[PDB]
Coordinates of C-alpha atoms in Angstrom, one line a residue:
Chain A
X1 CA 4.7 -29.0 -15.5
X2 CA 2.2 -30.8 -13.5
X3 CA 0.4 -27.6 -12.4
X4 CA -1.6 -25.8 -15.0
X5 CA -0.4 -23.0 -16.5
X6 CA -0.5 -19.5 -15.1
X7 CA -3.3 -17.1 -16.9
X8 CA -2.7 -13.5 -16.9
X9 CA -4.7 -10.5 -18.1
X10 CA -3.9 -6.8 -17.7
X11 CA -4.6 -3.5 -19.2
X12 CA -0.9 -2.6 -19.0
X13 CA 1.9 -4.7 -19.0
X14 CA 5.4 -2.7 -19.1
X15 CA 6.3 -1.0 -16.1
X16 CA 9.5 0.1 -17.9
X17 CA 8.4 3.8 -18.4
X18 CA 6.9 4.3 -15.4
X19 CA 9.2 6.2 -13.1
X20 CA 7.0 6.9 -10.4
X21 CA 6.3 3.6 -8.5
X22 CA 2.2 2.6 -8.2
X23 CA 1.7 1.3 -4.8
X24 CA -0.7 -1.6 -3.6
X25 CA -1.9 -2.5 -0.4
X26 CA -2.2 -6.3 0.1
X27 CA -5.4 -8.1 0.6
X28 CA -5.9 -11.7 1.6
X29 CA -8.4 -13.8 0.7
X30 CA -9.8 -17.2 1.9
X31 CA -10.7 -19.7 -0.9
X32 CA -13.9 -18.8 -3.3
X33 CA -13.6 -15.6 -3.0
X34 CA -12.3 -13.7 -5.2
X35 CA -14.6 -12.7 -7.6
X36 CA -16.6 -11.1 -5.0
X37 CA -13.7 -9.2 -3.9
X38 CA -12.9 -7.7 -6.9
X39 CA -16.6 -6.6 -7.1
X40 CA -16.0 -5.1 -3.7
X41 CA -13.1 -2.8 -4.3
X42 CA -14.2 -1.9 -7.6
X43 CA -17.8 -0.5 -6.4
X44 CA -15.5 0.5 -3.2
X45 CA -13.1 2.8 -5.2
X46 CA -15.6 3.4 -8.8
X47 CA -12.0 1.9 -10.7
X48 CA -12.4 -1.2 -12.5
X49 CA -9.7 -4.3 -12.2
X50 CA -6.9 -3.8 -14.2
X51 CA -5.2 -7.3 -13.8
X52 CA -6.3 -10.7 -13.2
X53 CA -3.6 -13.2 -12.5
X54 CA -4.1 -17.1 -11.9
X55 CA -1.3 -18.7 -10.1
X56 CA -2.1 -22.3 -10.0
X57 CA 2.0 -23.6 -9.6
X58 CA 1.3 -21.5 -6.2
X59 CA -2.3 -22.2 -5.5
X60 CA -2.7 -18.2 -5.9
X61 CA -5.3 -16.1 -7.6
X62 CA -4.3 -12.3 -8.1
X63 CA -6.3 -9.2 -9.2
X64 CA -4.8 -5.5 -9.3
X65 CA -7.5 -3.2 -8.1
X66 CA -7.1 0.2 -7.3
X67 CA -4.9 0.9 -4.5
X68 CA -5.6 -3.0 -3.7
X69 CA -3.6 -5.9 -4.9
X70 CA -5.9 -8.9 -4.3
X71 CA -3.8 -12.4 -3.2
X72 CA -6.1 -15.3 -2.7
X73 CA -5.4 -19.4 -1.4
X74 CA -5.1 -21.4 1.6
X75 CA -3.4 -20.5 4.7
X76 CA -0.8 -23.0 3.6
X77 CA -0.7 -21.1 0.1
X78 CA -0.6 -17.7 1.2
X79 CA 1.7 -18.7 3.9
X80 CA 5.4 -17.6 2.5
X81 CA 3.9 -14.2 1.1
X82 CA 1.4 -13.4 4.2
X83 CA 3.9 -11.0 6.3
X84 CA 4.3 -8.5 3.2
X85 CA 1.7 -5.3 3.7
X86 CA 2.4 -3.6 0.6
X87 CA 4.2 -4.1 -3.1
X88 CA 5.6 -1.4 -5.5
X89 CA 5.1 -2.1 -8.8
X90 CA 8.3 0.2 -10.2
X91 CA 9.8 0.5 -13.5
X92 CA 12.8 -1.8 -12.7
X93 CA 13.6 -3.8 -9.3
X94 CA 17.0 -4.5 -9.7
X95 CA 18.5 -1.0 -8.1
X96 CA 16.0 -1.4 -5.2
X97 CA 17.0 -4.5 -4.7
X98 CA 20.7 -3.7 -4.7
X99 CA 20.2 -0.4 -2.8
X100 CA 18.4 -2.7 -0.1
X101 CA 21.2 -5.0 0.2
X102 CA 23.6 -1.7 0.6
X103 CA 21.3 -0.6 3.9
X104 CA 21.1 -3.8 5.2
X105 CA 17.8 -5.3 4.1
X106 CA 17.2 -8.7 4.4
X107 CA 16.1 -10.2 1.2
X108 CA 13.1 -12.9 1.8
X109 CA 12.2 -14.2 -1.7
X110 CA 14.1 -13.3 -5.0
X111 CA 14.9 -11.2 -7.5
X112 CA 12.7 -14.1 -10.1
X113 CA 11.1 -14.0 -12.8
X114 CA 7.5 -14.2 -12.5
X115 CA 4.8 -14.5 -15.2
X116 CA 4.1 -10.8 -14.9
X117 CA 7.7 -10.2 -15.2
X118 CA 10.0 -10.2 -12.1
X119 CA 9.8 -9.2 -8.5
X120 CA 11.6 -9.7 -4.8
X121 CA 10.3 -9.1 -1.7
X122 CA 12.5 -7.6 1.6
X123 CA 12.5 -7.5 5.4
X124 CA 13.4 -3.5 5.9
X125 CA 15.4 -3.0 9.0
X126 CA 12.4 -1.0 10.6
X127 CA 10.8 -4.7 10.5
X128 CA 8.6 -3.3 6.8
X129 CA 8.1 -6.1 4.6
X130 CA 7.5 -5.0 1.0
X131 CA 7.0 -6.5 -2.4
X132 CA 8.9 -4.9 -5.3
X133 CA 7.6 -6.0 -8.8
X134 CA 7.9 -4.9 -12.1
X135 CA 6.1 -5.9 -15.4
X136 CA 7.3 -7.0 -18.9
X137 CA 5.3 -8.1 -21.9
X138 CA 5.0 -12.3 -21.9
X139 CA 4.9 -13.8 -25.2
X140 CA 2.1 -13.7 -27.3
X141 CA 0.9 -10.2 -25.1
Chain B
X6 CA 2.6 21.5 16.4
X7 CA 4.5 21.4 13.5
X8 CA 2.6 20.6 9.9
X9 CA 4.7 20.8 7.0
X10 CA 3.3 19.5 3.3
X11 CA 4.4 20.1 -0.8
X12 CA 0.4 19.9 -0.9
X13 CA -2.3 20.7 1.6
X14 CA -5.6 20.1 -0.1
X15 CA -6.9 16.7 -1.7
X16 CA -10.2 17.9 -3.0
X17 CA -9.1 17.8 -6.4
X18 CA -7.1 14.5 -7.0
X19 CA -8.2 12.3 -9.9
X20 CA -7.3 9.3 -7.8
X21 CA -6.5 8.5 -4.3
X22 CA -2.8 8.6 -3.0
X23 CA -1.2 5.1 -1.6
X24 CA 0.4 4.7 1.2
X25 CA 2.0 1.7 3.0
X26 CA 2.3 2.4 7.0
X27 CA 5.6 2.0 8.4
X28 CA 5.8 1.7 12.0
X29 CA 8.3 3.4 14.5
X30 CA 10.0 3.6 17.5
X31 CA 10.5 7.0 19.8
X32 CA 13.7 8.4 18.4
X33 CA 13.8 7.0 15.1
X34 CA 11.7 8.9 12.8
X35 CA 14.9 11.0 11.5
X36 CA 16.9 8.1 10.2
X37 CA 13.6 6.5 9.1
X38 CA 12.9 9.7 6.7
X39 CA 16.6 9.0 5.0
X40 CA 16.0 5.9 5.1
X41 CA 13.1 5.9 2.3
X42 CA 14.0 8.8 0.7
X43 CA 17.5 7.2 0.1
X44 CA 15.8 3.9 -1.1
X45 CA 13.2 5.6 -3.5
X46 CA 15.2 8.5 -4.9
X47 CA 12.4 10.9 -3.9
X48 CA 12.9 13.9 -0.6
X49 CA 9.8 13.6 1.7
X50 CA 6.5 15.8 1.4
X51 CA 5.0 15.9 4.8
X52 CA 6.4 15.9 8.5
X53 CA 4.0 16.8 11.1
X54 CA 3.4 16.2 15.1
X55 CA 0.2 15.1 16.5
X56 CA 0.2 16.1 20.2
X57 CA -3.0 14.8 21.3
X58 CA -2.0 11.1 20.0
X59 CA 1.7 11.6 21.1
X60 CA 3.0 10.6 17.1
X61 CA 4.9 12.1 14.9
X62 CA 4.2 11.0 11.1
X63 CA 6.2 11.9 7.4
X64 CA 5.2 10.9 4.3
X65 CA 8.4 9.6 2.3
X66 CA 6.8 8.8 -1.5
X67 CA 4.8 5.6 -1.6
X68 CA 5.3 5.2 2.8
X69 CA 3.5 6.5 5.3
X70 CA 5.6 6.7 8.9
X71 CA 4.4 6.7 12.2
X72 CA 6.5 7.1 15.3
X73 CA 5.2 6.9 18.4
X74 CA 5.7 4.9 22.0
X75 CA 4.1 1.5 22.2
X76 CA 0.8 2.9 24.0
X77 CA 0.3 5.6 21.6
X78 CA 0.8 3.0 18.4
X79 CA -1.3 0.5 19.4
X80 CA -5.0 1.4 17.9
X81 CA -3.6 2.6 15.3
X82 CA -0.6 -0.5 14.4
X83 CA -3.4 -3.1 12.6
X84 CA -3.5 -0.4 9.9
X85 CA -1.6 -1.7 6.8
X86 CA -2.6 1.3 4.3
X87 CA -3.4 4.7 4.3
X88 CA -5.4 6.2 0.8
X89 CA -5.6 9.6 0.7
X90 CA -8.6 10.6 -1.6
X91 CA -10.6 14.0 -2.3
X92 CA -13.3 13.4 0.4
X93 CA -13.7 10.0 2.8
X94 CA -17.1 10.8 2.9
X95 CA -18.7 8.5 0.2
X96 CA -16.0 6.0 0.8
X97 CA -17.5 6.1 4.8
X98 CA -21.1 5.2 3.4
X99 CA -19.9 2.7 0.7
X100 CA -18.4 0.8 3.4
X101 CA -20.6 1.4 6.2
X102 CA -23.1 -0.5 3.7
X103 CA -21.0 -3.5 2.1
X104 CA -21.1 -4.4 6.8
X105 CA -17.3 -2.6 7.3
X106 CA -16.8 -1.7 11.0
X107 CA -15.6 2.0 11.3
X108 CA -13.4 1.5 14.0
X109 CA -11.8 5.2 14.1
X110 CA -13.3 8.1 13.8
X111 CA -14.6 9.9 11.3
X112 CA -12.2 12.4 13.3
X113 CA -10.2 15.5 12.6
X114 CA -6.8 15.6 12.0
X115 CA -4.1 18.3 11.8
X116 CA -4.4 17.6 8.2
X117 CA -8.0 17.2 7.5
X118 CA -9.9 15.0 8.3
X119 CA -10.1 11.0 8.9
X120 CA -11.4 7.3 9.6
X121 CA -10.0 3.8 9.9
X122 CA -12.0 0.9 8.6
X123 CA -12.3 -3.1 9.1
X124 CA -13.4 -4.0 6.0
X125 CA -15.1 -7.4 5.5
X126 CA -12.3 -9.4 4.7
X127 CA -10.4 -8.7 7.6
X128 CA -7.9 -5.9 5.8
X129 CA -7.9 -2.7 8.4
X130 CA -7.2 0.7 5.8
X131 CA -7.5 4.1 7.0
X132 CA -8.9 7.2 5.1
X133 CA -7.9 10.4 4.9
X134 CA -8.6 13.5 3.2
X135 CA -6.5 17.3 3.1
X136 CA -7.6 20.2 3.8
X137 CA -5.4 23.8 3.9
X138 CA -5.5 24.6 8.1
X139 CA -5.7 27.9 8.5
X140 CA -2.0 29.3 8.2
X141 CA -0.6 27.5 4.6

């Protein structure tokens, strides 16, 4: 493509055997920052970052820390992903996703693959907008 | 007031419980509780009323539900996350000195004990801790 390629580390990366969902508060971040930040929440929480994630198709940076998932970019970047307050990272999305579309969810962005594997994210009726993601080995991982 | 919960004391938890907050209107709170249980596969662990705030709250696995009139939602709505962790007290300090406003509390709760936090990059997180109250 004519973006560089995505870069992606993490200390685990299948979600397929974990049955209880981990959950993630979202964190935005302006430009330049992110580095910092994940010095933040680590001394914040005493846990060290277990994913770093550059996005550069999507302008996005991405760390996993602690409770926090980190999302830095623009305004303009962050825009389409802003609203969501929180994602699940869960063994497999699909039977959220269709028990979702059963209760009348509206479905925002997804189900795609993504270069940690493959998430969605949902407008719950209750106006709760969620990320669900889960995680699948990439080549070469 | 009613205070109902699987577990009542967070002193010994390796690492913090998540929550994402889920907002709610006055007469809702009942439907909401199917709602995520349904969705996640999992029966709620906590239900209790907190007269002096006028909100009733659940904890439905990985969501944390408020329900409450506009007036009594409204310092509390810019929360996105709640992390329930052994003691907030280090957490207070170690943000008090990264320049985090503490912008609730620290305060009791029917559950133990609390604060709610602006942290520098603008995110707004809450912190609780459990406690048994005395008849559990």
């Amino acid at each position: 493509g004519h973006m560089s390629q995505p870069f992606l580390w993490r200390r685990v990366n299948d979600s397929s055997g974990f049955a209880e969902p981990r959950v993630f508060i979202r964190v935005y971040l302006e430009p330049g920052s992110i580095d910092a930040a994940i010095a933040f929440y680590e001394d914040l929480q005493g846990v060290a970052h277990d994913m770093r994630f550059d996005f550069p198709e999507k302008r996005l940076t991405l760390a996993a820390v602690g409770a926090f998932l980190l999302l830095e970019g623009s305004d303009e970047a962050l825009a389409p992903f802003r609203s969501t307050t929180g994602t699940l990272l869960v063994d497999d999305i699909e039977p959220y996703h269709r028990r979702l579309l059963a209760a009348g969810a509206q479905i925002i962005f997804g189900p795609a693959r993504a270069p940690t594997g493959a998430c969605f994210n949902a407008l719950l009726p209750d106006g709760t907008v969620v990320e669900f993601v889960h995680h699948r080995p990439q080549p070469g991982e």
